[PDB]
Structures are given as C-alpha cells and as structure tokens.
C-alpha cells in the first residue's frame, strides 16, 4: 500500500504570526552585495539606549525653567510609558507596541544657563501608595539624588524598577485612578541668579530595561 | 552620576549608586527579526496590488516599527484571499506581464493562499523615507493580480533595520493615557 496518515481537525488553519515558511515560487536570484553598510541596528532597544530623546512639558517645550517663589516643585509626573511627558520620546515610542516591561529608565538633565548662574536640583522617586511629595524636605526621605551646576553640564539618574510583580503593564488602564508605578519628582533646591534659565531633560533605556509581549494596539 | 551632557556619549547610571542591585534582562521580544515577523493587514485593491511595505498602516505594530528605520531589508511572505488565479510578478517587470500564466500563478484553493517571496529589488537595501513624500518606483516586491482579492497580508522575514527614526506614542490630554484593559 502507501503510508497512511490522519488529517487532524483544528490544525492547519492559517495564523498571521505562525512560525513557518511559504513554498518558494521563483528561485536563483542573487542580491547586490550590501555587506558592511553604515548605521545598522539589529535590535530596537539598542537604539533606545544609545540615543536619548526629549521629554514634553507645559508650553510644549522639552525643558523646564527655574522659578523664584515659595514653590520649589519644578516638574512632577507619573512613572509610566503612557504619560503625556514621555509621549514624544523614542522610548515611549516602542512601548505602545508591547504590553509589558521591566528594568531601569534613565533620565538625563542638562543645564543650559549662562556661566554666571548656578542652581542645585533634586530628583526623587515616590513609590505608589501615598501622595507624592510637594516639598523637597518631604521628598528627602524617598530615594533621591542631588546635583548642581558646574563644569559638567549633564547629570544622569537611573529610576529603579520597583514593583510587586516582575513585570508592569505599559498601557494605563482606564479603571486606574492613581498610577501603579508611582511618581518621579523634580525639585529646585535653590538658584544663584538663574531666573529665566532653562534645564533640558532627556530619557533613554537603562542597562537592564527589558520589554516583551508585542501587541498591535492601533495608535 | 554627573557627566558632561553635551558629549552625547551614552551614560547609563545604575541602581548600585544608592545601593540597589541590577537584575537580569531577557530582551527576546524586542529583537528586530522576532518582533517584525508576523502578518499585518493591508487594504487591497480589486485587481492589481503592488507589493509594498509602506502600504501597511502607520499605527499598526508592524507598520510603526517598520517606519522607525530609514533603511530596511527583508524577504516577504504574503497571505491572500482571492477569486480566480493569483498571479505574481517580479520587481520591475511590465504591468502587461500579470496576464501570463507562465509567471508564478497560484490556482484557487480555499480558504486562502500563502506564498513566500524573495527580495527582488535591485537596490542593496530599501528605504522607508527617501529625499528627492513619493518613494521611487523601484521600491517594491512586485505586484499580484487576481479576478478579485478579498484580503492581503504581509509577513517580513529576516528583517534588518538601519539608522533608527522617531517612534511616537499617543499624546494624552490628561496626565495619563487611560484605556480599558482586559479584565474578568
């Protein structure tokens, strides 16, 4: 006879993401040699680590200006990749195509002011479960860093990944009133003669930043 | 961790500064070849459809992640639902060729028909953005014709990307972007 077989039900239907290859129609073509062209990237995270991008603030400017008043809160926002501030970054660009992430998100600060102006800043991480701090003295109990202006114009701060579950959703669920990942807060301790001087901020992936489960959300 | 921001050299600070410990990462799901290999829908045209990766919507997962690289290379797999006989033609061949059964032709077999197609363009690597709005006619994998085509899908194979470009998310009106998440 001939080798018998059983055609099984529920198998063989086409799957858009399935892991198998089409039957080749038309063979024996050779490509023009492309070897060692410049600027190649094999992974979309590496370009996210090596190329930080700007944030978004009120007035639609990627910087925050020093302020003189009783209010030392310079900028304050949710830690999420769906935030409005992050929205313009490349890092929050990839997020919309993945459900979950873990790892560190780095923030870069660069003081733009003139050489005769000096300021001192505080960045801090407010974990979830309590209202975020409205004053640097209140924030001083959180995880924080502090730096001032000088020869080096740039500071880099790693925002830890700290959560109960090993991964966290990228998207922000509509039934979530308060951010699950907490907030990060940026304060101005004081400023010498810094009125009207700008601090540009940047964001990029950290060493351990990991992103998984691709999904097409529209957007 | 302070440094000179104007340098543009990448500086990644870690949690060990204030006494944390960096954890282990598994990045498989962000791999370019992995993430771009899957089918994405393209609104077809009744008879002749030129195979082009830029026809994919920009907001789809495959469309967006494609457009973030200036220079891309990959093979192609198509999945087509059509009436009649689906005829494929290589890059740069005349339109009058699509009427010849000698060219690769897949006779109708329900529900649909899946093919695997080589990279047929003359250029060493294709491009998502071209400086010269229009993109040159030489960027395409060829065309397919059938009596009518109901659905069309693209699946990239062996994808390779170069020179990344901006990738944008949806800009919230409120402080966050709140969506309804699947819940029991």
């Amino acid at each position, epitope marked *: 006879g001939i080798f018998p077989v059983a055609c099984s039900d529920g198998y063989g239907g086409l799957v858009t993401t399935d892991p198998k290859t089409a039957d080749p129609v038309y063979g024996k073509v050779f490509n023009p040699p492309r070897n060692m062209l410049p600027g190649r990237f094999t992974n979309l995270l590496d370009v996210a680590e090596a190329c930080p991008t700007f944030l978004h603030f*009120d007035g639609d400017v990627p910087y925050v200006t020093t*302020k003189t008043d009783s209010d030392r809160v310079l*900028a*304050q926002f949710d830690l999420s990749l769906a935030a409005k501030h992050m929205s313009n970054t490349f890092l929050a660009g990839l997020a919309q195509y993945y459900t979950q992430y873990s790892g560190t998100v780095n923030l870069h600060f660069m003081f733009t002011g003139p050489t005769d102006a000096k300021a001192r800043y505080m960045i801090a991480y407010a974990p979830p479960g309590m209202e975020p701090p409205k004053t640097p003295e209140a924030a001083a109990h959180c995880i924080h860093a502090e730096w001032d202006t000088g020869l080096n114009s740039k500071f880099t701060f790693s925002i830890p990944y700290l959560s109960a579950a090993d991964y966290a959703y990228t998207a922000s669920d509509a039934a979530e*009133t308060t951010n699950v990942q907490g907030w990060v807060c940026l304060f101005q301790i004081t400023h010498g003669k810094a009125e009207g001087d700008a601090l540009v901020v940047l964001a990029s992936a950290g060493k351990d930043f990991e992103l998984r489960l691709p999904v097409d959300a529209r957007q | 961790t302070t440094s000179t921001g104007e340098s543009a050299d990448p500086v990644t600070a870690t949690v060990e500064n204030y006494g944390g410990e960096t954890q282990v990462q598994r990045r498989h799901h962000t791999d370019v070849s992995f993430i771009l290999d899957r089918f994405v829908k393209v609104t077809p045209k009744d008879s002749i459809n030129v195979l082009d990766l830029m026809q994919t919507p920009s907001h789809t997962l495959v469309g967006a992640l494609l457009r973030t690289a200036t220079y891309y290379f990959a093979d192609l797999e198509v999945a087509v639902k059509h009436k009649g006989d689906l005829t494929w033609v290589p890059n740069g061949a005349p339109v009058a060729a699509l009427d010849n059964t000698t060219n690769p032709t897949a006779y109708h077999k329900a529900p649909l028909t899946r093919l695997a197609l080589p990279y047929t363009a003359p250029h060493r690597v294709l491009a998502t953005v071209y400086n010269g709005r229009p993109l040159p006619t030489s960027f395409n994998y060829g065309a397919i014709k059938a009596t009518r085509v109901t659905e069309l899908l693209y699946r990239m194979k062996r994808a390779e990307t170069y020179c990344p470009r901006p990738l944008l998310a949806v800009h919230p*009106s409120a*402080a966050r972007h709140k969506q309804k998440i699947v819940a029991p």
Partner: nanobody
Amino acid sequence: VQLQESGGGLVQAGGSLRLSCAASGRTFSSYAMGWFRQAPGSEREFVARISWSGGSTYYADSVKGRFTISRDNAKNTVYLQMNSLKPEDTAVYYCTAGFALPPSDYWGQGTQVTVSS
C-alpha cells in the same frame, strides 16, 4: 475621593460665570486642580490649572486672559471665573484634580454651560 462641579447655567455673549468645584475624601491642599471642557461633537479639550499653593497657573490659549482660575484650600474648593464669554465656549466643564502638570485623574461629573448669541 469625589469632585462636584457647580455654577453652570446659561448666559449671553460678553457675560460671565463663576464655576465652583468641591473636593472630598482627602487633603485638597496637596493636589493640583484644573478644568477640562468638552464642546459637543468635538473631543474634550484642556482649560486651566492651579497648583496646590495657588501660586502657579496655566491657561489654554483660547481662554487665555478671558478666564481666571483660583482655589480655596480652606474651603476645600476651586474656582474658574469665566469672563467675556463667547458662543464657542459652550461646553460641559469638567473639574479635575491631580498631581501632574496637567491635573488629569479624579474627575467630577462636569456642569453644563451654554452662552448664547
């Protein structure tokens, strides 16, 4: 934590209204406060903001100079004083609390305002 708008109504062009929003359930002096407006058939747009200290504000361009936001931490409430009203301003005005530069989360139900001409 729940918000309640009030002070809405009807008016004719050039008029003025004072909207009132009361907060409940937690400290009001720790929150930034802001207003959103949804004009019918358009998506909802931003209006104005006030920091917890009452010091800093921000106004949407179209409403810039016509409207004035103010909060009372003693009275646990926030106010939007609408002036030089214009038939475009017809919308439902949502009171919003929150932390972020835009106040966002913790919305009230919003009040109806129709200026006529």
